[PDB]
Amino acid sequence: GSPEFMGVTLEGPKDLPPQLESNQGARGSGSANSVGSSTTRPKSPWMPFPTLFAAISHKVAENDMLLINADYQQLRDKKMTRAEFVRKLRVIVGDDLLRSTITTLQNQPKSKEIPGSIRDHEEGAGGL
Structure with a gap:
């Protein structure tokens, strides 16, 4: 009998986890590049495009080279430049x-x- 009631105390958690965190190491990835090749043409050797088409006819498809003959003809009509027909040729055939x-x-x-x-x-003789 006859209580006194010892009241509520006010402590809490305080031995908490270590707070440190990493940002250690390195990171990176990428690639970009561009390449080509070219040479001048001497006058002596012989390589006209209308004959070149007959020498690749064994290596192209007939409807694929039908397109090349058309793209070459509209170069002659000034609808297109030589270098622009070459840029759409080297995607069909290859340089x-x-x-x-x-x-x-x-x-x-x-x-x-x-x-x-x-x-x-015959004989040139005279005075016979």
């Missing part, structure tokens, strides 16, 4: 393939005959 045809264009046969103008050769 490595172009290079590999040059040696065959240098293998090609030719002739430029004339019909026989002179046939006389």
Whole structure:
């Protein structure tokens, strides 16, 4: 019997976790680049485009080279520049393939005959 009631105390948690955190190490990833190749053309060797199309006909598809002949003809009509038809050619055929045809264009046969103008050769003698 006869209580006194010891009242509510006011402590709490205080031995809390360590608060430190990392930002250690490094990070990064990427790649970007651009490359090409070019050479001048001497006058002596022989590589006209209308013959070049007949030398790749074994290496192209018939409706794919039908397009090339059309894109080359509208270059001649000044609808397009030479370099712009070449930029839409090297996506169809390829400039490595172009290079590999040059040696065959240098293998090609030719002739430029004339019909026989002179046939006389008999004896020039006189005073017989």
